[PDB]
Amino acid sequence: GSAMALKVGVVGNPPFVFYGAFTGISLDVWRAVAESQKWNSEYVRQNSISAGITAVAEGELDILIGPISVTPERAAIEGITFTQPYFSSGIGLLIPGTATPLFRSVGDLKNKEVAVVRDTTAVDWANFYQADVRETNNLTAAITLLQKKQVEAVMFDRPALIYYTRQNPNLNLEVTEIRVSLEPYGFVLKENSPLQKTINVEMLNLLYSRVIAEFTERWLG
Amino acid sequence: GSAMALKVGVVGNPPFVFYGAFTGISLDVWRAVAESQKWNSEYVRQNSISAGITAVAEGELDILIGPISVTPERAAIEGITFTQPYFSSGIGLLIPGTATPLFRSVGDLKNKEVAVVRDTTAVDWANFYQADVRETNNLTAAITLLQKKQVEAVMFDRPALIYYTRQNPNLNLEVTEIRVSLEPYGFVLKENSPLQKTINVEMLNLLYSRVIAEFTERWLG
């Protein structure tokens, strides 16, 4: 169709989002939704989740997609609304194989030099657990600090950490059994958006038909 | 305060909803939300979920609370919108203790006389798995049919079934390990409701603070 394209902001990390142009679990979900409605899309990579949320509130974007945790603080932002969640993720920790005995619970996080990526929920969880928080620009930067020896762990979404370890088995890094939290992922629309109902129904259809589970299995099974 | 009360429709079964006047997990969640905003409530028991959803769409109710599964078909109903989910429930099966070997998977459901409560997601799941569906007016009626000997199982939300077995250990009924599905519970508001953002933030606060987990532990821990 020749209808005006929806402006789709993209933010996140593998396996949910990859940057060529754009691929990953989140993109598979959005594309299935867009395709079912014969919609045209224009993808714009966003610097951060909050930058993307502001762009949706300001009408600069029609929707923000990616592994975006639905949190009270974000849901409180004026002008935006979250879609129904499409994935239930856990926030975990990546540590050196030898540090396994040291990280058995969230209580062990206190005072430990924990690396986190700026503008992610991990920053807040790391501060809440009284870790020695060290913010970085990206996951690669946070892991490069662990690869060296400045931080005793990296706090980030569990699926992304697992994916990373699978691309670098040679590194001997391990994702602990510790779950700092369980957070649902959703997309961000403008409040009272006329697309909301259609997107929710479609995402729920994908969820219940186990199609999203297949997408996830393709990138992390 | 003397502000106009919100019309709160109530539907569901224990441990989420009990009928005196109204108590249970769902009522604890709603009350915490209402209390945080100093809101006044007027509770009206609903005959069924779809009856309650229509009452919200028609403006007869401001919100419908209870263990309401967020499904594509319901999200598609004109005039309504679901809040963010507050609980992740599983749909299970209640069978006689002796029938344990017979129910090891959803595939074993085909042709088995399965009892379901009218207007619940179990009706659709039972039909989808090709069981010999037998609709009843309520859970007590569906279980009374199992207590006799007409159905080989009762399909209903797992927490409600477990709660039931705990009030009647003398019956020797068992909730199988089979999970027909995993469904999130949410409340129903009028589409583009001015209360939406406030309710979502509050429910998310309750969720993340583990307060909802405490409510659930009180009625089913």
DSSP state of B149: T
Beta-carbon separation of A197 and B76 below 8 A: yes
Q: Rounded CA gap, A9 and A51, in Å?
A: 10
- Asked whether the beta carbons of A103 and A176 are under 8 A apart, the reply is yes
Q: Are residues A165 and A199 in the same domain?
A: no
Question: Residue B85, CB half-sphere, CA atoms under 13 Å: how many?
Answer: 24
- Asked whether the beta carbons of A88 and B88 are under 8 A apart, the reply is yes
Give the pairing of strands B181-190 and B80-82. antiparallel
B75 close to A (CB below 8 A): yes
Q: Rounded CA gap, B153 and B93, in Å?
A: 6
Q: Which of A72, A192, A204 has its CB closest to that of B72?
A: A204
**Chain B positions in Cβ-Cβ contact with residue A208 (cut-off 8 Å):** 71-72, 181
Annotated ligand binding at B121? The verdict is: yes
The residue of A37, A179, A207, A210 whose CB has the most chain B CBs within 10 angstroms, and thus the best one to mutate to test that interface, is A207
- Asked whether the beta carbons of A65 and A10 are under 8 A apart, the reply is yes
| A positions 12-31 inside 8 Å of B (CB) | none
Beta-carbon separation of A204 and B75 below 8 A: yes
The shortest C-alpha distance from B129 to chain A (Å) reads: 13
Phi, psi at B18, each rounded to 5°: -125, 145
Place of tokens 């594309």: A31
Q: Rounded CA gap, A105 and B183, in Å?
A: 29
Closest chain B residue to A200 measured between Cα atoms?
A: B75
- Positions at the binding site of A: 13, 67, 69, 74, 121, 157
Q: Rounded CA gap, B217 and B221, in Å?
A: 4
CATH of the domain at B97: 3.40.190.10
Q: Rounded CA gap, A98 and A117, in Å?
A: 23
B72 close to A (CB below 8 A): yes
Q: How many CB atoms lie within 10 A of CB B113?
A: 15
3-state class (DSSP) for residue A185: strand
Q: Are residues A82 and A57 in the same domain?
A: yes
Q: What's the domain count of chain B?
A: 2
B184 close to A (CB below 8 A): yes
3-state class (DSSP) for residue B92: strand
Place of tokens 């209580």: A107
Q: Are residues A153 and A192 in the same domain?
A: no
Q: Are residues A42 and A80 in the same domain?
A: yes
B175-178 — which CB contacts under 8 Å span 24+ positions? Answer: B175/B92, B175/B93, B175/B94, B176/B92, B176/B93, B176/B94, B176/B95, B176/B100, B176/B103, B178/B92, B178/B93, B178/B103, B178/B104, B178/B105, B178/B106, B178/B108
**Chain A positions in Cβ-Cβ contact with residue B77 (cut-off 8 Å):** none
Cα torsion angle, A102, A105, A110, A113, sign:
positive
Q: Are residues A24 and A94 in the same domain?
A: no
Q: Are residues A145 and A108 in the same domain?
A: yes
- Per-residue DSSP letters for B95-115? EEGGGGGG-SSGGGGTTSEEE
Residues sharing a CB contact under 8 Å with residue B16, sequence separation 6 or more, in sequence order: B24, B25, B26, B66, B67, B87, B159, B160, B185
Q: Are residues B67 and B102 in the same domain?
A: no
Place of tokens 């993808």: A43
- Asked whether the beta carbons of B57 and B190 are under 8 A apart, the reply is yes
Q: Rounded CA gap, A211 and A205, in Å?
A: 8
A90 close to B (CB below 8 A): no
Closest chain A residue to B82 measured between Cα atoms?
A: A84
**Chain A positions in Cβ-Cβ contact with residue B71 (cut-off 8 Å):** 204, 208
Beta-carbon separation of A208 and B81 below 8 A: no
Beta-carbon separation of A196 and B82 below 8 A: no
- Per-residue DSSP letters for B26-78? HHHHHHHHHHHTT--EEEEE-S-HHHHHHHHHTTS-SEEEEEEE--HHHHTST
Q: Which of A72, A75, A200 has its CB closest to that of B75?
A: A200
Q: Rounded CA gap, A51 and A44, in Å?
A: 12
Cα torsion angle, A220, A158, A33, A206, sign:
positive
Q: Are residues B41 and B150 in the same domain?
A: no
Q: Are residues B10 and B77 in the same domain?
A: yes
Q: Which two tokens stand for residue B118?
A: 């009218």
Angle at which helices A196-208 and A211-220 cross, to 10°: 70
Find the domain containing B177 and state its range: 90-182
- Asked whether the beta carbons of A121 and B204 are under 8 A apart, the reply is no
Phi, psi at A106, each rounded to 5°: -60, -30
Q: Rounded CA gap, A58 and A7, in Å?
A: 12
Residues sharing a CB contact under 8 Å with residue A142, sequence separation 6 or more, in sequence order: A115, A116, A117, A136, A151, A154, A156
Q: Are residues B78 and B14 in the same domain?
A: yes
Place of tokens 């109902």: A197
Q: Are residues A171 and A200 in the same domain?
A: no
Annotated ligand binding at B45? The verdict is: no
- Asked whether the beta carbons of A85 and A66 are under 8 A apart, the reply is no
A196 close to B (CB below 8 A): yes
Beta-carbon separation of B197 and A191 below 8 A: yes
Angle at which helices B211-220 and B158-167 cross, to 10°: 40
Q: Rounded CA gap, B203 and B9, in Å?
A: 17
Q: How many CB atoms lie within 10 A of CB A168?
A: 11
Q: Are residues B128 and B168 in the same domain?
A: yes
| Cα separation values, A29 from A19, A207, B62, Å | 16, 9, 32
Closest chain B residue to A191 measured between Cα atoms?
A: B192
